[PDB]
């Protein structure tokens, strides 16, 4: 299609073409009745036996890195119309389906004291029925949300066909739903309180850790999560150097400092050196005051181990992590403004494939009218409250020089023809 070819090859002509789809009313910004009109006849499907994915021109602009065309106001109003059509509704539905399981477990935690067992009748201590209705409704909501998650994931097992294995969000959801089921089960089957609160800890922790993955779809929140992913994978890659260096210092401090309680076991010494990584060395408690009481076996080697540990782990390794973090964040923020709109257009073109086609005909609109002086009204007010080039130059240079040398070659051939056909009298010999 010619629009995709203009996006791929000559984007400035596509900008000129998009400039025609901006109809100004009277060129007076002070007028309350002033408006502008956006037409979307070039952004639509090329048909309007092969099939096309939705948002053809937008995917072509994203895949060709034409970020100056994504920031064009026709494209911005096209994404805004596409959002207010169905995307906000589907996104709030998807978020509420998880938040319906998120909220009552947090209420159930912050009301009931940990350690105690509780049925649907109340808190077993002797028992009370003060807020038993709220506890019962919260356990019913968490149980129904968990079995709905089981049904959805059991559908996605047969839908994915052994392709969901290399995904951490599915693993987190299995942990959340199983652990919340075991936390809720004392309304049916009696379970001791130790296992119940052991599961309540893990369930609340992984609920609020998994909600960050639902935060990826926003524009003002996704880039922090992307940077978090990059730095966490880099730490994952450095963990073996972490393990061997920390194991060196842990076994060494297990040997030299044996009589002290923080280094009694080798595993406790490993965890103590991991706590000492950040700089909480405890110099006076572990090294100085045992030395002044003659309680250090091998004191000279102990202070040498202290100065070697303080040089290696909290200074060198931590600044290595800081430098890796600065490099990775600079790498991500080099391409952030394209990444935001790319995630938005990927969200819209992934959600639009599953919608029914009559709904897609009914909600679609080919042109919009914006009044700049009149603010949008209630729901839109609440939404506004909650919301708050040298390579191509040398390439053109090279094209013009190639045209120049072609014309000069033709001219040289014509001059040789002149010498071949010229008449020479009184200049011979």
Ligand X SMILES: CCCCCCCC/C=C\CCCCCCCC(=O)O[C@H](COC(=O)CCCCCCCCCCCCCCC)COP(=O)([O-])OCC[N+](C)(C)C
Binding positions for ligand X, rule: CB under 6 A: 79-80, 83, 99, 167-169, 202, 209, 212-213, 216, 218-221, 225, 228-229, 232, 235-236, 239-240, 242, 246, 270, 274, 301, 304-305, 307-308, 311, 344, 386-387
Interacting span for its own copies (CB under 8 A) from 3-11, 56-64, 77-85, 313-321: 313-321
CB of 230 to ligand X, least distance (A): 8
* Of the residues 171, 320, 369, 384, which one makes contact with its own copies according to CB under 8 A: 320
CB of 268 to ligand 6OU, least distance (A): 6
Residue list 241-270, contact with its own copies (CB under 8 A): 241, 244-245, 247-249, 251-252, 254-256, 258, 261-262, 266, 268
CB of 201 to its own copies, least distance (A): 4
Task: Write the CB contacts of 331 (distance below 8 Å, at least 6 apart in sequence).
Answer: 230
- Alpha helix ranges (H) inside 36-124: 56-63, 67-70, 73-82, 88-111
Torsions phi, psi for 36 (to 5 deg): -135, 150
CB atoms under 10 Å from CB of 225, counted, come to 15
Torsions phi, psi for 78 (to 5 deg): -70, -45
DSSP label at residue 278 = T
Q: Is 192 in the site for its own copies (CB under 8 A)?
A: no
CB of 367 to its own copies, least distance (A): 32
CB of 365 to its own copies, least distance (A): 32
**Mask for 195-234, x = binds its own copies (CB under 8 A):** --xx-xxx-xx--xx-xx--x----xx--xx-xx--xx--
54/351 Cα distance (integer angstroms): 10
Contact 320, 234 (CB under 8 A): no
Q: What would the two tokens of residue 149 be?
A: 């998650």
Residue 372 binding result from ligand 6OU, its own copies, ligand X, none, given CB thresholds of 5 to 8 Å by partner type: none
* Of the residues 71, 280, 353, 374, which one makes contact with its own copies according to CB under 8 A: 280
Task: Write the CB contacts of 38 (distance below 8 Å, at least 6 apart in sequence).
Answer: 21, 22, 23, 73, 74, 77, 78, 367, 368, 369, 370
46/4 Cα distance (integer angstroms): 10
Residue list 368-427, contact with its own copies (CB under 8 A): 390-391, 393-398, 400-405, 407-412, 414-427
Residue 167 binding result from ligand X, its own copies, ligand 6OU, none, given CB thresholds of 5 to 8 Å by partner type: ligand X
Q: What would the two tokens of residue 295 be?
A: 């309680």
CB of 424 to its own copies, least distance (A): 5
Q: What would the two tokens of residue 209 be?
A: 């850790």
Q: What would the two tokens of residue 229 be?
A: 């992913």
Residue nearer to ligand 6OU on the CB measure, 89 or 298: 298
Chain residues binding ligand 6OU by CB under 6 A are 103, 106-107, 110-111, 131, 134, 168, 171, 174-175, 178-179, 199, 202, 236-237, 239, 243, 247, 265-267, 270, 298-301, 303-304, 307-308, 311, 388
Q: Is 118 in the site for its own copies (CB under 8 A)?
A: no
Residue nearer to ligand X on the CB measure, 6 or 87: 87
Task: Write the CB contacts of 317 (distance below 8 Å, at least 6 apart in sequence).
Answer: 242, 245, 277
153/144 Cα distance (integer angstroms): 14
314/279 Cα distance (integer angstroms): 6
Q: Which residue is nearest to ligand X (CB)?
A: 229
Q: Is the dihedral of CA 177, 182, 188, 193 positive or negative?
A: negative
């Amino acid at each position: 299609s010619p629009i995709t070819e203009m996006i791929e090859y000559l984007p400035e002509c596509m900008k000129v073409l998009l400039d025609f789809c901006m109809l100004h009313s009277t060129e007076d910004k002070s007028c309350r009745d002033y408006y502008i009109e956006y037409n979307f006849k070039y952004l639509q499907c090329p048909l309007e036996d092969v099939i096309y994915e939705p948002l053809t021109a937008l995917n072509a602009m994203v895949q060709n890195n034409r970020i100056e065309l994504l920031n064009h106001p026709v494209c911005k109003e096209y994404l805004l119309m596409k959002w207010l059509a169905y995307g906000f509704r589907a996104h709030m539905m998807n978020l509420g389906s998880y938040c319906l399981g998120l909220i009552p477990m947090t209420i159930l935690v912050v009301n009931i004291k940990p350690g105690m067992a509780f049925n649907s009748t109340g808190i077993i201590n002797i028992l009370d029925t003060t807020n038993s209705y709220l506890i019962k409704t919260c356990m019913i909501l968490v149980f129904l949300s968990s079995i709905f998650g089981y049904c959805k994931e059991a559908g996605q097992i047969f839908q994915q066909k052994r392709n969901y294995f290399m995904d951490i969000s599915n693993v987190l959801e299995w942990i959340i739903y199983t652990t919340g089921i075991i936390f809720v089960l004392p309304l049916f089957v009696e379970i001791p309180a130790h296992l119940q609160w052991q599961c309540g800890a893990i369930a609340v922790y992984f609920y609020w850790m998994n909600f960050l993955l639902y935060l990826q779809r926003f524009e003002n929140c996704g880039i922090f999560i992307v940077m978090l992913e990059v730095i966490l994978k880099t730490l994952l890659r450095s963990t073996v150097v972490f393990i061997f260096l920390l194991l060196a210092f842990g076994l060494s401090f297990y040997i030299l400092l044996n009589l002290q309680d923080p280094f009694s076991s080798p595993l406790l010494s490993i965890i103590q050196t991991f706590s000492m990584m950040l700089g909480d060395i405890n110099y006076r408690e572990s090294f100085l005051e045992p030395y002044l009481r003659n309680e250090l076996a091998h004191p000279v080697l102990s202070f040498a181990q202290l100065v070697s540990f303080t040089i290696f782990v909290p200074i060198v390794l931590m600044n290595l992590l800081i430098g890796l973090a600065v490099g990775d964040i600079a790498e991500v923020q080099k391409h952030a403004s394209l990444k935001r709109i790319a995630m938005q257009v990927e969200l819209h073109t992934s959600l639009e494939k599953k919608l029914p086609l009559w709904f897609l005909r009914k909600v679609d609109q080919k042109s919009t009218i914006v009044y700049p002086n009149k603010p949008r009204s209630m729901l839109f007010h609440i939404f506004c409250f909650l919301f708050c080039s040298l390579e191509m130059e040398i390439l053109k240079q090279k094209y013009r020089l190639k045209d120049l040398t072609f014309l000069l070659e033709k001219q040289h051939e014509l001059i040789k023809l002149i010498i071949q056909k010229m008449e020479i009298i009184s200049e011979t010999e």
